[PDB]
Design a protein around this nucleic acid. Structure first.
Lengths: 959, 417, 411
DNA sequence: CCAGGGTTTTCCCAGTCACGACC
DNA sequence: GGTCGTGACTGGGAAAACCCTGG
């Protein structure tokens, strides 16, 4: 029946599914390839181990266009990007009218005529635009000025915050405080290119309606990254070389992502201006009022530069990215939407409060020891302190330029007047001493810098500028590693001093040292271990990696019995929110009023009238990574959920409005699967051709043969170590890395044998190198050879959709350098194209069956869609069939004509009301000690598998 | 104990608590039967009460103060174990009149028991007596709260000192908050107030880790919490919170339900009562214990000092005179004294004492009193207007201009919070 | 009589006095049988106590605080008239067992009376026990004084309503001052304190002429002076001054007489005791009675008023006005001005009615926020004393308020 | 008798290194 | 391996407060 198998006994797709999705017939592999593959697998001895068959799945698909998978995808992509490319070419080939004479002064939009006539048009009416937005951050995040360009003429928009001067404005943004840039219901859809368009997008008025109007965007920064981008190391070296290894031609075919540098790289000409006054970054609303003309001129200059880059760039992008699916997906990664209810403000309050209280606890614990350290200055008691001796203990001199009886009432008044006058007389003696005040003299040198100066507006009493990272904090706490006092040198980082030097080496100690170069005679300076190897200096003892060292007895607080462990526990508590508090609290929210909410959301019983439901539009650079990934300052870097990190529930606070539920999933072992499938296509085109491939696909993690376990079995080390080594190897690492990590995980193995162990371990995994040169005899030799073949080609296209690598990484310019970056680029760019395929398929499938759906976020592998409550499982079925289609297409591009069932469907299409890793976890955070059902009352979502989905949905897509 | 003994010694010596060492037992201090407090102790309690009142009533728009009569006149519910208040005039008339009988005496005692008043054991029952009027005050807007600081009387049991069956009457000053909340918002406000109280007690503490919270339920299953302090001998209950529900509220006015309904938006409900009561005296002793370091790490740490939070220390600054013209310097010191008094700063009149104590001795004496700063006016001060300041925590000597002392002190006290 | 009843009704309506009209007896108010004061009354008493404490303890170096417990344990001298603290358990147990005769019951009652604790009637007794240590506090230098603002308890024998020997219990809060002074210049100190307290009481009054002083002498010859305020129905005691002499001190510690001596100059002598005692509750009533003039508005002195400024929201969008009002409210609270958060109420009562209501509550100034406030930054401000409406910059409201409070204080 | 030449001190800002967040 | 913030520290330059010079 539906059950079938491959020449390597792997459960493939069902007969109905395979017939629908693979046409009919194919050039099946020959017996010679089978014999070679079997011989290979036997040689490594991973052959035969069967697995419990996965249940057969049947599904009749909606009509698949074209006469092949690739043709169907391309037809869909043409349908998706038909209007957007037309508008893009319309704008690219169009006469640009002359710049306006003088920018007018009227709230909102204003149209500028060819001769300079100015007319306020209610809304722009053009199919394409290039947009620059200006934000006066001092007076909030409301947008201020907009100058727009179009085929007709320039357009200008100014906020009310510049025209009229009210007393105060609402601190929470309303939809009325944005720009009316939309086409209300001769054409449909519009394209607004721009530089860092995500920044410009967030101030567009209609992009906050959840109904999901038809519009897309293109970031020229994304295009530049995709075309002539630079890595982190590449960017650093570019900047350094401009300020003042071989194959330096790449310095001439790339630049950083600032607008001026891109202008120089593409069109060159005169260097763009900068406006050094930087009024928008720092200024005043009245100041921007007075200097309108120059600032608007700079905005229009930015618009013109962006247009120049876009026009001179768009043909090149298609010349290097000739698959329409790539552009179509790049359109859909920039339309992210996240809904946020009234629980946002309470979240900020709770996070800030918890952070503040823990900060106060830590700071007072430090200050207590700080103040007591002053009492070691009198009597020269600083000298004998084993820890506080080398700090600054120098004072500063103050600069300079009987009986009884009651009283009569008149006498009392006279005495009061006399005393007051005598006091006021001395107040005039100011005519001496420095005019600029001194800052706490008398206190020792170390103390004065800790305290703030009284001229500071936010001054607080005492040494309140103490954090655990300060170089004097550990000595102020007097930490003693293994009963040896600490010490810091900038030549070898932190460390501990062991007394016993008579002028060498220790008599009775071993460790990272001694280092005779840093000499404090009488002792030796060893080095604390780090998680990055001995070549790195330990920067701050109060670090995460020292948490095991708190309890094990190796590390002692010294001047405490329990403060130390509490100190590092508080450190780990507020570490994340310390960094994230700026951008987390700097986000924009447009609380959509009840008027603009959908009818259904209001009709829903769980709707709240007093509550406020709003949304956030993430700023995502669609291609900000050399691997063409997305870049988002906060959400791509947001902690998921933990019970020991403050503010770690940020993702969970993203909640659907009433009447909507989130539907999402996550790819499984994506990088490893792509490596395996590439290796299989390279060897014989059969799945499981390589040992790595079988371990990735049919590997039995429960009992027996699997990728993570098998490496451990060969080496003989713990499973966790083997997994770490395998991830490092797929990222690309050498033998010295392996030997260092092996010596780290076990101090009982000597390097003399550790080197042999590492070389044998690598030989088993990747294999040796014989000269015909390539990788042969290794369990993963085929995939490494395939990756290097793709990387070292003259024009390395992505294996899947053929988007060429960034021209700064071409072999013609780098040659035998940056190999690791390119080989990683192969896999990661394949993954990004895979995400694009997923998104385009999802868009088509949701448009085909009139599913009311929207995009939540594309967190690399993850995909989350926001769909209405009633058709929640229909969206799940759409996602599952999308996964099937995209994986089949991925296999077909390499040429394989079959796909295993075990990967044919998503493992868990999660339905939930708040984004989190699992629908089950309540994620009781330190800022929400009770729980989500108790602080905000969300239920645990339902997670479904393919069989459950087809059973609930009857395996159909219509209503 | 030795550290605790030293702390009790200091609190007696520098006039923090009043009484003799026999009366200064831990049980006496905890039970509400201590002989009294020293003047500095009264100042400390006043400061703590002021901070609590600000943080609870001042910064809440829906909370109002309430005053409970110190006694509850009868007739009372049967079974009450509270003491009875009897006028001495009635007893004098009873004992002087020789025409009375045994039966007349029995009838008189029955009448006294049936018609006697009681001292307040808790602030809650009297607080509810003002619910109708206070509800009218806030235009029937629920939630709303009533607060009150004052002394409540409790019984004390003992076995060693009690010879002739004498049951002692103990007094304790209590801060009570009655918070009337909609039933849907029971645990919401309960947790919120627990968090706020724990933050308030941790805010002024030198070592907040010794403060703790613990959840506990009553015999009826209504939710509650108890907060403790880690004394050198163990935790002591310093504050309790209970979700009383509505049993007490319905029992107080059983007549009609329509008078006691409260509005939560557009709906009228009978509200649930959250009662928050804390032990001021125990907390004062606890802050005294917290301020004193129990040194048991650096072996060379002398100078017993009382690191009270600056907003709670009883006397802010102290003045002294050095060598120079006594009359002019005294005029300067009196001027500075009046100036610092006019700005809400408590000042210790140290320039009046004629003892020529050594400077180290005076520094120790002012430190034991937990004085934030030591101000010294000398001949140079009359010369140019520079004054000295010895910070309690730092013990470092600095100089500031004499007109710059007022602003520095006010900014210090304000921003310390 | 109508005016007094009208004023009592006003104080009851606006939460100065608490309880029902029948429970609000003028005799009950004077004698301390009142059911309690309203929250506005609580704030008024707090302000009065603040001004008394500032005027007495803060500004004089020889006055130190003293804390006396509310009871005095047994045994007690016979003839004391204070309420006897009685445990109901023993009375019930004695009632249950009738085996004891009349004489045995009398003996038990006498034993209990000799061993019954008492509630304090005046802080004077408690202060003397603190004379030794508090004397040690000033290095034996005289004079020095003690003070304690607090409440006492006093018996009330209402001849109007007593049938079954029912004596009520009255509680009055009084401020005490015990000035241990050398005998040489005692009456000079007496005169100083007397004039000072007359000035203090007249300081906050609208018509200070209604306050008066009078001299008196006890049975033992101790000179004394007493202050009275002219309530509409008559003069009532508001504070008493007595030259107690040294009877109490000598009685207290009958052994080593030298230990209780005080150092006056170069000699050691027994000091004379001066007593200052006044009913802060009755003074609060006195000020309220003073404030009534016929527009019924309570013009309590600004330094003692319970509510200093009131806020409201005018016609316009609610949320913006509410946010601005909350900001202003927080700023005002942060700077030590007590405010009324009237901006929450939604009842569309007329501005005239609202002004009347706030004035009857003794509110110094009234701030209202409307759309024009968001337009330009001027807030409508109403003067209680002048019935004139002033528009002032919303930013500068707090400085104007604190200046008004200070200027009232120094005048 | 004061403006400045040169002196010094102090304030500030670009860069550097270690750290901890999602993949 | 790629990517993003941060904070503590630091060196060098710019702004502001001094000495005695002399016509």
């Amino acid at each position: 029946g539906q059950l079938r198998h491959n020449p390597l006994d792997i459960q493939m797709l069902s007969r109905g599914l395979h017939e629908q999705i693979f046409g009919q017939g194919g050039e099946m592999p020959g017996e010679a390839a089978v014999r070679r593959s079997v011989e290979h697998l036997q040689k490594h001895g991973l052959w035969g181990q069967p697995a419990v068959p996965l249940p057969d799945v049947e599904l009749r698909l909606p009509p698949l266009y074209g006469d092949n998978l690739d043709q169907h995808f391309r037809l869909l992509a043409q349908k998706q990007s038909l209007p957007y490319l037309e508008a893009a070419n319309l704008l690219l080939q169009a006469q640009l009218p002359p710049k306006p004479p003088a920018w007018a002064w009227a709230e909102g939009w204003t149209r500028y005529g060819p001769e300079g006539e100015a007319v306020p048009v209610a809304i722009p009416e053009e199919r394409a635009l290039v947009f620059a937005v200006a934000v006066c951050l001092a007076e909030g995040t409301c947008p201020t000025l907009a100058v727009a360009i179009s085929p007709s003429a320039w357009y200008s928009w100014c906020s009310q915050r510049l025209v009229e001067e009210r007393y105060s404005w609402t601190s929470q943004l309303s939809p009325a405080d944005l720009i009316p840039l939309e086409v209300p219901t001769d054409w449909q859809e519009q394209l607004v290119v721009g530089h860092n368009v995500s920044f410009d997008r967030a101030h567009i008025r209609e992009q906050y309606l959840i109904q999901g109007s038809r519009m897309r965007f293109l970031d020229t920064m994304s295009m530049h990254m995709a075309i002539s981008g630079l890595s982190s190391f590449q960017r650093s070296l570019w900047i350094a070389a401009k300020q003042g290894i071989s194959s330096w031609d790449w310095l001439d075919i790339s630049s950083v992502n600032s607008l001026a540098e891109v202008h120089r790289l593409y069109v060159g000409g005169p260097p763009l201006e900068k406006e050094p006054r930087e009024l928008f970054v720092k200024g005043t609303m009245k100041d921007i009022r007075e200097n309108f003309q120059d600032l608007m001129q700079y905005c229009a200059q930015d618009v013109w530069a962006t247009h120049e880059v876009f026009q001179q760039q768009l043909p090149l992008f298609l010349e290097r990215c000739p698959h329409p699916v790539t552009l179509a997906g790049m359109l859909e990664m920039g339309v992210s939407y996240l809904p946020v209810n009234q629980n946002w403000e309470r979240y900020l309050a709770e996070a800030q409060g918890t952070y503040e209280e823990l900060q106060r606890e830590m700071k007072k614990s430090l200050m207590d020891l700080a103040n007591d350290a002053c009492q070691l200055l009198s009597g020269e008691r600083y000298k004998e302190d084993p820890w506080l001796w080398d700090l600054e203990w120098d004072l500063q001199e103050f600069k300079q330029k009987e009986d009884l009886g009651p009283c009569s009432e008149e006498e009392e008044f006279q005495q009061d007047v006399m005393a007051r006058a005598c006091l006021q007389k001395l107040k005039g003696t100011t005519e001496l001493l420095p005019k600029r005040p001194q800052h706490l003299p008398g206190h020792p040198g170390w103390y004065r810098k800790l305290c703030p100066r009284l001229d500071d507006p936010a001054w607080t009493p005492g040494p309140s500028l103490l954090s655990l990272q300060m170089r004097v904090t550990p000595k102020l706490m007097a930490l003693t590693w293994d009963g040896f006092p600490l010490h810091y040198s900038e030549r070898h980082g932190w460390g501990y001093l062991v007394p016993g030097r008579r002028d060498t080496q220790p008599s009775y100690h071993h460790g990272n040292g001694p280092y005779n170069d840093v000499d404090i005679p009488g002792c030796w300076f060893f080095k604390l271990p780090h998680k990055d190897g001995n070549s790195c200096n330990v920067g701050s003892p109060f670090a995460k990696d020292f948490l095991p060292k708190m309890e094990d007895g190796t590390l002692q607080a010294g001047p405490g019995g329990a403060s130390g462990p509490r100190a590092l526990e508080i450190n780990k508590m507020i570490s994340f929110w310390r960094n994230a508090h700026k951008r987390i609290s700097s986000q924009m929210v447009v609380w959509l009023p009840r008027s603009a909410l959908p009818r259904a959301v209001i009709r829903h019983p769980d709707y709240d009238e007093e509550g406020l439901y709003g949304a956030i539009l993430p700023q995502v650079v669609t291609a900000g990574t050399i691997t063409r990934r997305a870049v988002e300052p906060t959400w791509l870097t947001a902690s998921n959920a933990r019970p020991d990190r403050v503010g770690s529930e940020l993702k969970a606070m993203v909640q659907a409005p009433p009447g909507y539920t989130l539907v999402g999933a996550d790819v499984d072992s994506q990088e490893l699967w792509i490596a395996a499938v590439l290796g299989d296509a390279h060897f014989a085109g059969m799945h499981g051709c390589t040992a790595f491939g079988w371990m990735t696909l049919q590997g039995r993690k429960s009992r027996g043969t699997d990728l993570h376990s098998k490496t451990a079995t060969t080496v003989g080390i713990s499973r966790e170590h083997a997994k770490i080594f395998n991830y490092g190897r797929i990222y690309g690492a050498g033998q010295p890395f392996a030997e260092r990590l092996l010596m780290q995980f076990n101090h009982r193995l000597t390097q003399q044998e550790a080197a042999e162990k590492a070389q044998q371990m690598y030989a088993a995994t990747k294999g040796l190198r014989w000269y015909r040169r390539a990788w042969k005899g290794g369990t993963e030799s085929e995939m490494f050879n395939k990756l290097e073949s793709i990387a070292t080609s003259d024009i390395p296209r992505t294996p899947v959709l053929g988007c060429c690598i960034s021209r700064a990484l071409e072999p013609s310019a780098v040659q035998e350098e940056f190999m690791t970056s390119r080989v990683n680029w192969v896999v990661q760019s394949s993954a990004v194209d895979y995400l694009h395929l997923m998104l385009v398929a999802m868009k088509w499938l949701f448009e085909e069956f009139a599913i009311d759906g929207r995009f939540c976020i594309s967190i690399h592998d993850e995909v989350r869609y926001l769909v209405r409550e009633e058709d929640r499982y229909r969206a799940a079925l759409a996602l599952q069939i999308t996964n099937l289609l995209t994986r089949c297409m991925f296999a077909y591009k390499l040429g394989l004509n079959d796909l295993p069932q075990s990967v044919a469907f998503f493992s868990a299409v999660d339905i939930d009301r708040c984004l989190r890793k699992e629908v089950t976890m309540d994620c009781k955070t330190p800022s929400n000690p009770t729980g989500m059902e108790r602080r905000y009352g969300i239920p645990q979502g339902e997670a479904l598998d393919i069989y459950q989905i087809i059973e609930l949905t009857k395996g159909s897509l219509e209503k | 104990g030795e550290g605790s003994e030293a702390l009790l010694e200091i609190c007696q010596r520098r006039h923090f608590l009043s009484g003799s060492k026999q009366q200064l037992s831990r049980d006496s201090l905890l039970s509400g039967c201590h002989p009294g407090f020293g003047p500095l102790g009264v100042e400390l309690r006043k400061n703590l009460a002021a901070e609590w009142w600000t943080s609870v009533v001042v910064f809440r728009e829906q909370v109002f103060p309430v005053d409970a009569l110190h006694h509850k006149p009868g007739p009372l519910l049967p079974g009450d174990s509270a003491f009875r208040l009897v006028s001495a005039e009635t007893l004098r008339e009873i004992l002087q009149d020789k025409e009375l009988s045994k039966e007349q005496l029995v009838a008189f005692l029955e009448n006294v028991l049936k018609t006697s008043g009681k001292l307040r054991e808790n602030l809650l029952h009297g607080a509810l007596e003002h619910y109708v009027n206070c509800l009218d005050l806030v235009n029937k807007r629920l939630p709303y709260g009533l607060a009150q600081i004052g002394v409540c009387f409790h019984p004390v049991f003992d076995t060693k000192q009690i010879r002739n069956g004498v049951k002692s009457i103990g007094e304790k000053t209590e801060a009570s908050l009655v918070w009337f909340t909609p039933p849907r918002t029971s645990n919401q406000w309960l947790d919120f107030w627990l968090r706020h109280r724990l933050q308030w007690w941790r805010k002024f503490a030198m070592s907040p880790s010794n403060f703790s919270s613990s959840d506990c339920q009553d015999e009826e299953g209504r939710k509650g919490n108890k907060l403790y302090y880690n004394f050198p001998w163990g935790k002591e209950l310093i504050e309790t919170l209970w979700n009383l529900g509505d049993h007490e509220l319905l029992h107080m006015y059983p007549g009609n339900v329509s008078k006691l309904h409260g509005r939560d938006g557009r709906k009228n409900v009978v509200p649930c009562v959250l009662s928050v009561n804390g032990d001021l005296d125990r907390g004062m002793l606890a802050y005294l214990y917290d301020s004193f370091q129990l040194t048991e790490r650096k072996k060379n740490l002398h100078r017993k000092v009382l690191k009270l939070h600056p907003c709670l220390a009883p006397i802010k600054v102290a003045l002294d005179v050095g060598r120079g013209p006594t009359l002019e310097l005294r005029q300067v010191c009196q001027g500075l004294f009046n100036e610092l008094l006019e700005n809400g700063i408590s000042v210790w009149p140290g320039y009046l004492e004629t003892m020529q104590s050594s400077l180290e001795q005076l520094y120790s004496k002012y430190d034991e009193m937990s004085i934030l700063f030591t101000v010294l006016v000398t001949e140079t001060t009359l010369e140019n207007g520079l004054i000295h300041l010895r910070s309690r925590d730092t013990t470092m000597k600095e100089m500031m201009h004499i007109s710059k002392l007022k602003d520095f002190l006010i900014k210090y006290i304000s921003s310390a919070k």
